Amino acid sequence: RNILTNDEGLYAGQSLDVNPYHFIMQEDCNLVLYDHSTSVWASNTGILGKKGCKAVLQADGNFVVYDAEGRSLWASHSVRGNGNYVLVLQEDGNVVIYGSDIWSTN
Amino acid sequence: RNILTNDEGLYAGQSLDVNPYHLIMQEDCNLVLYDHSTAVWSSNTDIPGKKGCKAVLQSDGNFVVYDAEGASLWASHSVRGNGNYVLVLQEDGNVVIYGSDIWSTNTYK
Amino acid sequence: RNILTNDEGLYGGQSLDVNPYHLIMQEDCNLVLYDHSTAVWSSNTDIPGKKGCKAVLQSDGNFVVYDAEGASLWASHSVRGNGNYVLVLQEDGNVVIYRSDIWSTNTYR
Amino acid sequence: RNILRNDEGLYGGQSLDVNPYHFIMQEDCNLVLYDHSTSVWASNTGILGKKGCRAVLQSDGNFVVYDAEGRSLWASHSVRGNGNYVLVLQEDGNVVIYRSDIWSTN
Ligand SMILES: OC[C@H]1O[C@@H](O)[C@@H](O)[C@@H](O)[C@@H]1O
Ligand SMILES: OC[C@H]1O[C@@H](O)[C@@H](O)[C@@H](O)[C@@H]1O
Ligand SMILES: OC[C@H]1O[C@@H](O)[C@@H](O)[C@@H](O)[C@@H]1O
Ligand SMILES: OC[C@H]1O[C@@H](O)[C@@H](O)[C@@H](O)[C@@H]1O
Ligand SMILES: OC[C@H]1O[C@H](O)[C@@H](O)[C@@H](O)[C@@H]1O
Ligand SMILES: OC[C@H]1O[C@H](O)[C@@H](O)[C@@H](O)[C@@H]1O
Ligand SMILES: OC[C@H]1O[C@H](O)[C@@H](O)[C@@H](O)[C@@H]1O
Ligand SMILES: OC[C@H]1O[C@H](O)[C@@H](O)[C@@H](O)[C@@H]1O
Ligand SMILES: OC[C@H]1O[C@H](O)[C@@H](O)[C@@H](O)[C@@H]1O
Ligand SMILES: OC[C@H]1O[C@H](O)[C@@H](O)[C@@H](O)[C@@H]1O
Ligand SMILES: OC[C@H]1O[C@H](O)[C@@H](O)[C@@H](O)[C@@H]1O
Ligand SMILES: OC[C@H]1O[C@H](O)[C@@H](O)[C@@H](O)[C@@H]1O
Ligand SMILES: OC[C@H]1O[C@H](O)[C@@H](O)[C@@H](O)[C@@H]1O
Ligand SMILES: OC[C@H]1O[C@H](O)[C@@H](O)[C@@H](O)[C@@H]1O
């Protein structure tokens, strides 16, 4: 993985890997960005044992984490209406949600 | 590779590969999108004698092609404005360009 | 749906349905064939910690189950080489893969 | 419908469908493929009043169109030995026959 396409997601354990940096949806609903092994960013919604979480980039541009019972845990709050967006784990360590198709090769 | 952050580009012979699909700046200045081994899209800039071209994504969102010192042969025309763009060769095939950051963690190095 | 033309794919939570039969790709990587409610065939992959898999009909004739950005969980082993194949969930229940084209009206679009 | 298995067929008026695509065995005895109302392919064996025809996919892998009695009018001539086959009307507007089976679950 490296980029999550429109309406794609990460289940518990799955992650976005690029160099020592890794964005992961942990065993507890906590999304973290690690530099090697040091946590540098997290959604801070961690609750030991609370598994079955999903992190999915919705079509409206919102990035939401969901509880096993489909409830919202945390949301990026981008939601710029319907379109085509992508979340990329950049090599410079940043996580960016670039939105709205500007061009396409058909 | 697989992506192109604005200001990054493909030189005379480099590619972006998402397995069946391919995007390569061949040696004849022609930038084409293959499917396995079947041309599906083209820049149409393989002028005879011309060589050493480059595909370049930019800050203004324009995906341009160039030859000997500047001079654009082709240029998508997706010049939306100065921002942050990326050209990605998707899993489905379609080569898309995404317009400016909507949200980030601002955790750059 | 009841068919997969060559390089198609059954993604997490998707199925092929015909009469009371159903070849559904469950949440867990288990590919199962039911008779409305009873399981009558299985890939056998209800693996703990394996969510979101995909069953896809390969171009080489092989039908395999893939992990989330993973590998071969299951395989029909029906590898016969590259051509055109198809998997169908028939009304007699039997799910079959048919080896390459013999005749076509050549009416592609 | 959209598939014809070993020894299945179309009687005068029957057809396979999938979106605006239509493979039909008309009362003219002419097998035709229609995009909407526009014809696209045909056997060109039509005769007004020539009804009672049946198109049948066979074990030898042959798609034969038969007369009201029981004689050959047209045939794909895809005879490639006894086996199992299918004729599908694909979502791309093409009609193909597939050589035998290579894998089945039951
Ligand atoms: O149209 C695409 C086609 O153009 C030709 O001129 C060559 O450059 C080929 O390599 C390429 O596949
Ligand atoms: O986590 C991505 C990136 O975040 C910034 O804060 C950097 O200073 C490092 O901590 C790291 O490389
Ligand atoms: O044998 C089939 C059977 O396998 C179990 O492990 C579960 O996945 C059930 O949902 C399924 O019906
Ligand atoms: O060649 C057959 C094919 O031709 C296309 O032009 C369309 O008419 C389709 O509806 C049809 O399936
Ligand atoms: O903030 C980083 C830290 O946050 C929580 O404590 C947990 O999710 C840990 O696994 C993680 O290392
Ligand atoms: O906070 C989560 C919530 O945020 C916004 O309201 C929307 O994007 C919803 O789709 C999402 O579930
Ligand atoms: O045209 C842009 C749009 O095209 C297709 O729908 C897909 O490739 C989308 O992922 C992409 O954003
Ligand atoms: O503000 C978003 C912007 O932040 C930093 O400048 C970089 O990570 C860019 O790639 C990103 O687009
Ligand atoms: O049309 C080509 C032309 O388009 C815009 O003006 C810019 O992207 C220029 O850099 C480029 O040369
Ligand atoms: O192990 C299953 C294996 O079967 C065949 O070799 C191919 O379809 C491979 O792609 C697949 O991985
Ligand atoms: O030659 C038969 C072949 O024709 C085209 O390639 C496509 O419509 C395929 O689906 C089909 O199997
Ligand atoms: O040849 C195609 C043409 O054949 C006959 O004329 C008729 O059955 C028409 O409906 C059909 O379109
Ligand atoms: O040419 C028509 C003829 O072809 C083959 O011989 C067989 O399929 C026969 O059944 C059929 O009558
Ligand atoms: O799988 C081969 C063969 O098996 C059974 O005989 C039936 O289900 C046929 O429809 C199928 O073609």
Give me the DSSP letters along D51-65.
---EEEE-TTS-EEE
Contacts of D5 in chain C (CB under 8 A): 90
Our mutation pick for probing the ligand 1 site, out of B23, B42, B65, counting the most ligand atoms within 8 A of Cβ, is B42
Region of A60 please: left (phi>0), alpha (psi -120 to 50) or beta.
Answer: alpha
Distance C28 CA to ligand 3 centre (A): 9
Taking the CA of residue C54 and the nearest CA in chain A, the distance in Å comes to 14
Distance CA B3, CA D40 (A): 42
Chains A and B touch, contact meaning at least 3 pairs of CB atoms under 8 angstroms apart:
yes
| CA angle at C71 for the pair C70 and C77, rounded to the nearest 5° | 155
Residues of B with Cβ-Cβ distance to A103 under 8 angstroms: 61, 63, 76, 78, 96-97
Q: Out of D88, D92, D105, whose CB is closest to C95?
A: D105
Question: Hey, are the CB atoms on A11 and C69 less than 8 Å from each other?
Answer: no
What resolution, expressed in A, was reported for this entry? 2.8
Q: How far apart are CA D105 and CA C95, in angstroms?
A: 6
Q: State the nearest Cα–Cα gap between A50 and chain C, in angstroms.
A: 14
Residue in chain B closest to A96 (alpha carbons) equals B104
For chain C, the three-class secondary structure string (H helix, E strand, C coil) is CCEEECCCEECCCCEEEECCEEEEECCECCEEEEECCCEEEECCCCCCCCECCEEEECCCCCEEEECCCCCEEEECCCCCCCCCCEEEECCCCCEEEECCEEEECCCCC
The span from the CA of D29 to the CA of D50, in Å, is: 6
Which residue in D96, B49, D7, D56 sits closest to C101, CA to CA? D96
Query: Buried b / exposed e across D58-90, counting CB within 10 Å, b at 16+?
Result: beebbbbbbeeeeeebbbbebbeeebbbbbbbb
For B40, which DSSP code? Answer: E
Q: Which two tokens stand for residue C104?
A: 């076509």
D partners (3+ CB pairs within 8 A) are C
Strands (E) located in chain D: 3-5, 9-11, 15-17, 22-25, 31-35, 38-42, 54-57, 63-66, 72-75, 86-90, 94-98, 101-104
Map residue D89 onto helix, strand or coil: strand
What is the amino acid identity at position A87?
Answer: L
Residues with CB under 6 A from ligand 6: A 58, 60, 62, 64, 72, 75, 79
Number of other residues whose CB lies within 10 A of the CB of residue B55 = 24
The three-class DSSP label of residue D48 is coil
Cβ B96 under 6 angstroms from ligand 7: yes
Beta bridge partners of D104: C96
Amino acid at B109: K
Residues facing C17 on adjacent strands = C22
- What is the C-alpha separation between C77 and B78, in angstroms, rounded? 46
| Ramachandran area for residue B7 (φ above 0: left; ψ -120 to 50: alpha; else beta) | left
Cα D76 to Cα D23: distance, rounded to the nearest angstrom: 15
Q: What does the alpha-carbon distance between residue A65 and residue A53 come to, in Å, rounded to a whole number?
A: 7
Q: How distant is the alpha carbon of residue D31 from its chain centre?
A: 7
State how far the Cα of B95 lies from the Cα of B4, in Å rounded to an integer. 11
A47 vs A26, A27, A67, A69, A71, CA distance in Å?
Answer: 10, 9, 11, 15, 15
Question: Can you tell me which atom of ligand 12 is nearest the CA of D28?
Answer: 8
Q: Which residues pair with A3 in a beta bridge?
A: A88
Q: Give residue B38 CA to ligand 10 midpoint distance, Å.
A: 23
Tracing tokens 């299918």 back to the chain, one arrives at: D86
Which amino acid would we find at residue C52? G
Instruction: List, in order of start, the domains of chain B with CATH numbers.
Output: 1-109 (2.90.10.10)
- Residue B108 beta carbon below 6 angstroms from any ligand 8 atom: yes
What backbone torsions phi and psi does residue B16 show, to the nearest 5 degrees? -140, 120
Closest residue on chain D to C104 (Cα) = D96
* D105–C98 CB contact, under 8 Å: no
Cα–Cα–Cα angle for B50, B55, B57, rounded to 5 degrees: 150
Phi, psi at C94, each rounded to 5° = -60, 120
Residue D11: strand pairing partners:
D54
Q: Which residue has the tokens 């990605």?
A: B88
Evaluate whether A102 touches B97 at the Cβ level (below 8 Å): yes
Report which DSSP code applies to D28. Answer: T
Neighbours of B61 (CB within 10 A): 24
Report which residue type is found at B36.
Answer: H
How far does the CA of residue D42 sit from the closest CA of chain C (Å)? 9
Phi–psi pair at D5, nearest 5 degrees: -90, 180
This entry's atomic model was obtained through X-ray
Check CB contact under 8 Å for D103 and C94.
no
Report the candidate in C63, C47, D11 with the shortest Cα–Cα distance to residue C55. C63
Neighbouring CB atoms inside 10 A of A12's CB total 19
**Cα–Cα distance measured from residue A84 to residue A70, given in angstroms and rounded to the nearest whole number:** 23
List Cβ neighbours of C57 (8 Å cut-off, separation of 6 or more).
Answer: C4, C6, C7, C8, C9, C63, C85, C86, C87, C97
What tokens were used for C90? Answer: 């028939």
**Which ligand is closest in space to the CA of residue B33?**
1
Judge D/B contact: 3 or more CB pairs < 8 A.
Answer: no
Q: Is D78 in the pocket of ligand 13 (CB under 6 A)?
A: no
Q: Please classify residue C69 by burial: count the beta carbons closer than 10 Å to its beta carbon, then call 0-12 exposed, 13-18 middle and 19+ buried.
A: exposed
Count of Cβ atoms closer than 10 Å to residue B65 Cβ: 23
